[PDB]
Every structure is written in C-alpha cells, then in structure tokens.
C-alpha cells in the first residue's frame, strides 16, 4: 500500500510541473504579441498580414 502511495505522489508532482507550462506559454505569448510587434517600429508591409 505504501508503495502505491509513492507512485501516487510521483504522478501528482509530474502532473503539476506539466500543468504550469500552459499558463507560462499563454502569458508569454500575450506579452510578446502586445510589445514586440505592436510598438511603432512595425514595418508597414506587415500591416496587412497583421490585421
């Protein structure tokens, strides 16, 4: 039974450390979109692709 306890703990920790990356990616994408290619240095060419 205690072996099974250990297995449960292992699965839970790997689940959590995999879970956090989705929020990481979401926030990173939002920030990078809002800053890197929305500031006024955008090449007017890419305006069409961007809209």
């Amino acid at each position: 039974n205690e072996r099974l306890e250990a297995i449960l703990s292992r699965e839970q920790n790997l689940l959590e450390e995999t879970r956090k990356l989705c929020m990481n990616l979401k926030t990173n994408n939002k920030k990078r979109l809002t800053e890197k290619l929305i500031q006024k240095d955008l090449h007017p060419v890419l305006n069409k692709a961007m809209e």
Binding site: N1, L4, E5, L8
Partner: protein, 54 residues
C-alpha cells in the same frame, strides 16, 4: 527428613506451579489469540480498503 523423597515432591511442586502458571497464561493465550486474530483480520480489511482507494 528425606532429601530424595523431598526431591520428588519438590520437582512435583515445581511441575504443578509451572503447570498452574503455564495453563493460566496458555488459556489466556487461546483467548487472546482468538480475539487478536479476529482483530487483526479486521485491520487487514482496513488495509485492503486503503489499497482499493489508491
């Protein structure tokens, strides 16, 4: 007055004292083993329930 007969009776007295104590805690043991066997069976049920939950 007789060491050899007092002996036979001293070993008989030790035999009867050890029979007394031995059967007292041996009958205590049959009772205790029965009740503790049922008790340990029940705790084993609890352990199996934990196994199922996991």
């Amino acid at each position: 007055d007789d060491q050899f007969r007092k002996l036979l009776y001293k070993l008989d007295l030790r035999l009867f004292q050890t029979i007394s104590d031995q059967m007292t805690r041996d009958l205590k043991d049959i009772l205790d083993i029965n009740v503790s066997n049922n008790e340990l069976c029940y705790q084993l049920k609890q352990v199996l329930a934990r196994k199922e939950d996991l």
